[PDB]
């Protein structure tokens, strides 16, 4: 339930994080502010962290 | 030929190690003391080094 | 158009490089001086950088 003023401000992002073991990966779900991510391609949900 | 006081004390562990070139890999095995490794998944052949 | 003095001095090498993202790879090619590379394959076109 998002106040109109906040629509588009937050995005729910799923990513592949590294783990303690070099050969394993884990799925992580976290909430980012729109100001910290950028789109990559347009008309797609591929987003990356702003400073990479 | 392992005496009773050595049971189990040593383990013969194999793993996939990195090498000089990023697209190459090698199979390595070595002998570890039991005190340096910790079982992963309770009773299983899978183990990780104690400090990883 | 290579003069006689330069035959075998330069090679056109293609490789897969890392990118800004952990999951994305790029094909890169460049011109190397022969003195900077060492063949790993006998008759193959496989070479590696001199200091790896």
């Amino acid at each position, epitope marked *: 339930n998002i106040t109109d003023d906040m629509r588009g401000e937050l995005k729910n992002c799923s990513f592949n994080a590294t783990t303690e073991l070099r050969n394993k*990966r884990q*799925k992580v779900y976290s909430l980012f502010y729109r100001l910290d991510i950028v789109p990559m391609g347009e008309n797609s949900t591929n987003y990356r962290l702003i400073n990479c | 030929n392992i005496t009773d006081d050595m049971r189990g004390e040593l383990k013969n562990c194999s793993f996939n190690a990195t090498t000089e070139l*990023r697209n190459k890999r090698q199979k390595v095995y070595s002998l570890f003391y039991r005190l340096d490794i910790v079982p992963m998944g309770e009773n299983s052949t899978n183990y990780r080094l104690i400090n990883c | 158009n290579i003069t006689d003095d330069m035959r075998g001095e330069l090679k056109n090498c293609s490789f897969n490089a890392t990118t800004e993202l952990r*999951n994305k790879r790029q094909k890169v090619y460049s011109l190397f001086y022969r003195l900077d590379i060492v063949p790993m394959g006998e008759n193959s076109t496989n070479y590696r950088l001199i200091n790896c």
Partner: antibody
Amino acid sequence: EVQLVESGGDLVKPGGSLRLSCAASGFTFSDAWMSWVRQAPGKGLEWVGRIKSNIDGGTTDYVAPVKGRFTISRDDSKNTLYLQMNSLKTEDTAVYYCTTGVETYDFWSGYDDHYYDYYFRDVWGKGTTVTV
Amino acid sequence: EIVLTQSPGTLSLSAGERATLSCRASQSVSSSYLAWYQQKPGQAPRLLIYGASSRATGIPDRFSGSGSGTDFTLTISRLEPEDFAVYYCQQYGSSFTFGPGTKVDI
């Protein structure tokens, strides 16, 4: 080695209820999507339904002819999958199986996800029944 | 739901022959969801191939398939005694329904 340890089969009539279930061994269900399929004697394979991992929402999908009377849930402690059936038809006689897809990606490095060993295992339970 | 049918209705091939089995979807389900399974009678079905391409781990390389729109297929390059089983295709066009099951016989 990965196994779905299936149990709960029994002798039932349409005028009753039955819960079938599978406990995992080796494989855990924290990231397991799972699905039930049934095969009536003399018939081919009919999908019953699917449950997504609770970490991805716990959403389920059911096949229209079996919807409502056949539902799917997950334990999340002892790795057990459940199929709860109630108020069944004479048409529901079948061997039911639990199935899952095991995806293993063993990476060659912790610095790039380019070179790795991908293994895909289709794991089935033994098959239990719903009788009439 | 998704309706899949098979052709030929039964296969009658000797071991060593190319036991090709095809199927058809009423729905134009993308090939990226195609799968085939081998069911030895009395056993749970075993996945051979998925994504109209990827082989399941442990499956012999005599098994390979392909497909596109409604036209999907499985090739056994050489039939072996281990293959005399019922084969099914599955098309996950938002539902994993299966075809009826086609027996490979001689």
